[model samples]
Target: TWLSDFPQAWAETGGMGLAVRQAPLIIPLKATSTPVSIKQYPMSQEARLGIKPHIQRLLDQGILVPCQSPWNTPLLPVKKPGTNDYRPVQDLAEVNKRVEDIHPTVPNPYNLLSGLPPSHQWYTVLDLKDAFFCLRLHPTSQPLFAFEWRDPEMGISGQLTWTRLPQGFKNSPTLFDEALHRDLADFRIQHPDLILLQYVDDLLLAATSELDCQQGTRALLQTLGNLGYRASAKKAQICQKQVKYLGYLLK
Candidate 1:
């Protein structure tokens, strides 16, 4: 996972930063590998015996837990516009807070909905696979994802998983978005011909023509796939004037 190198890059770059161009599948320079040290419980005691001292610390903290399976869930975060801040906001508390500070009257419930105009146009929607698991924790933070428990057959184990991380946890989406804001900003692509929106793993891409929409979808899929992420072809929808993505309709 590209996320594994984040700490090193941040360290090398003097805590500068990375960016997330797209909501769901932002491309990065480096891709991360399956969390080698902490993503899974050591299958054997011999494997557990070799863990480093620092990895031990991560176990003590509630930063990581064992995975029910190697497959992981996605982390969705609320992205603040024009900023690199992605916070794990479970509800509209922040949005509501903003409303309180400004508008006394109720705001439209569909302010952020994405859709097509009166003119008919083709659109596509895509879903990214194992989005969060695509990134590995910083080596220093690997310990934070450590787990401790005794399976009757396995005895005590000290493997780490996402449960200990900030992103895979319930509030992870917001935090991930906040963390990847810069990546999205750095991506240089534009298309007035279409609309793009995202909610966690789901992606909505719209365009004025069927060909244009299909082209965009293919390009996106190819780009992210090259970066070592998977896009579900089965869930991806083709040309249509009206399409549903995330939870909204596009027409």
Candidate 2:
């Protein structure tokens, strides 16, 4: 019923979000830094075959684009836990060294959870899917994340880079948290009766009763969709007396 009410909030149906309320993330390279092109490491034919589909999906979504850039990083094929399947993970060590550091504005776990009041027993939790992908990277900063790619079957070879913020980059978590906070500020102001705790992309709605919690969750989901953010429906814990959040159980 919640999914029908706010279809865009669910990741499966909504696809990836492009945060319209926030400005594109501008990456600042160090003054002394220069472009570094790292060559791809040798991979087994099987690994490359496994990575093909993932690349196609990214390209289709316009998240990855072919580029001619001086900067290049290699993708490390990391095997998924409990499976032999490989996933492309960019080696952003070179980029991180060149990028300027930003102060982490994220609250510590203790501080974040402390905001929950004892009077609020009803809870609703949501974890945003691919939260960083919703935060767009500025065009100028996009090429800084370029990585070499070669699709053996497609007869295509080029450097591809991300249009949105990519994982493995330094300061991504901080940047995303700040951007999300900026986007959600108004929702916070409008819902004074409810406590919406946000630790980056993870959100918790704490209310005094089940009815309040249900209503608050609905509003929250609708607001998130309007802001171009999708919640993982499969992972969401909605309107529960006892729930798990941030690896800890809340009662």
Candidate 3:
């Protein structure tokens, strides 16, 4: 009487209350937008749009700001239960253990493993516009990012509020990939021409021909855009003899 060995899992059995995956959540953009009540940074609408409002509020209260010296490294937040003071964690042994080095060139001498190719292959790379910002957190994890502020500067020494789950917190990328994959699976749009690939935010799609590549790109871009996500037109490149993605040069 049973249809399969798994005894009809919800997803396979068409259960109405199936759990769905979600894209990686975004870390609220703070320093890029509002004036830091404590530090000196110019405020502008363009910059504000790049950051999340809740993050802006935190920076206004002097809770966080972009790293001054290195510039434009991923956002960093102060560890909890510590007073407001800026210091780099200098213990090399500890830092090295935490950071894993990923090199793009190890697989080849001349050709980067751009992608797997077959005859008549064409490729397209799509960069999402503010990819990370598109994701929102669960309702429960919102209080961890509070800060106090003056007009132009903010005080970093605020009590910990244990906010919503932070995006980019080590495991966020995997979560995002799973969610995006699931959504795509649910929609079940299939084509003989396209093959899709992704990194944390970057997406690469390969096709059997130029026309397929183009149409596939349009379809994916439209779908993501409709979900409040945007793909960067400037960064998206079309097929070439060889292409590189996530550091590998694919043939």
Candidate 4:
């Protein structure tokens, strides 16, 4: 299988794979002054129990760290749709309000894919797992994402901050999109036959023939792997005539 040929490109689970970049994420605050910290919201025992392991895993992976900061946000346990699993989400609305908005660099999916050449029938879609977590946040800006958490049963109580970009940040999508764009710019130029469109972490590569599609998908995955990005095996659609890209059906 093509995937077996590049085992490093696929992750068994969501994480920060090998894809590391030298660029430091610049998060511009609305003003030079620090914003007042918001108190942590009350969470249920059940919710806290559900979130404990996930938080530990994140910390173990170096995605999060213990910290004391003037900027504190609430942590909400969000249940995944149609699943019993829970994901820890930091409420960043207060912080977002204090941060400067980066003009969205994401292209309109409908308009972007509409321009695909008529001959580009074959397609491959790659979704980077835990997309935002793959990018490291600047040390100076990490404090903005600090949140308080405690596991009473384990007698653990403290504050934690994201070492990498958190999902709810207003500028995360734009920053990640720009970073991936810069990494793939040369690939796009080198392979004019492939129609590539990226919406944040979702990458769509279109080609006119199966051979071209396979080659392009392999090349793209290899490039991403070399750059320390891992494609989610569960979400990837490799070399198909018809597939979904950016929520729209394409053939």
Q: Which regions of candidate 4 deviate over 4 angstroms?
A: 13-15, 80-84, 153-155
* 1-251: candidate 3 lDDT, tens digit per residue: 11132221112232111112343234333333321222223434333333434455544533344322211112323332454333211112221223333332223322323445575468777665433334444433332232222223433332232122233344345545555565565333676456676665576777777777767766665555444445554455665546767766666
Clashes of each: 26, 0, 23, 4
Model 1: per-residue Cα lDDT at residue 74: 24
Query: Relative to the unseen true structure, what is the C-alpha lDDT of residue 129 in candidate 3, on a scale of 0 to 100?
Result: 47
**lDDT tens per residue, model 4, 1-251:** 86677776787632367347645565788766576688888987778888888999988899889898999988899988898778798889989988988888777867788788888999999888877887888888888899998876775688889888888888888888888898889999999988998888898899989999999988988888888788888778999998988788886
TM-score of candidate 2 to 2 decimals: 0.97
The most accurate candidate by lDDT is 2
User: Per-residue CA lDDT of candidate 2, range 1-251, in tens?
Assistant: 88888999899889988788878778998889999999888888888887888988899989999898999988988878898788999999999999998989788878888877899999999999999898888889999999988975695798899999999988888888898888888888998889988887888899999999999899899989999999999999999999998888898
Candidate number that wins on TM-score, 1 or 4:
4
Off by over 4 Å in 3: 1-117, 145-168, 186-188
Best candidate, TM-score-wise? 2
Query: What local lDDT does model 2 show for residue 20?
Result: 82
lDDT of model 3 at position 47: 35
Clashing pairs in 2: none
lDDT of 1 by residue, 1-251 (tens): 32232222212221211122333322211133243222222344433332332333434543344543322222124445786444332232221222112211322226535233644367776665545544445444333333343344433443334432233343335434343333332222545555655554556666767788777666554444434444555565766677776566665
lDDT of each: 0.42, 0.89, 0.43, 0.83
Model 2 stretches with alpha carbons more than 4 Å out: none
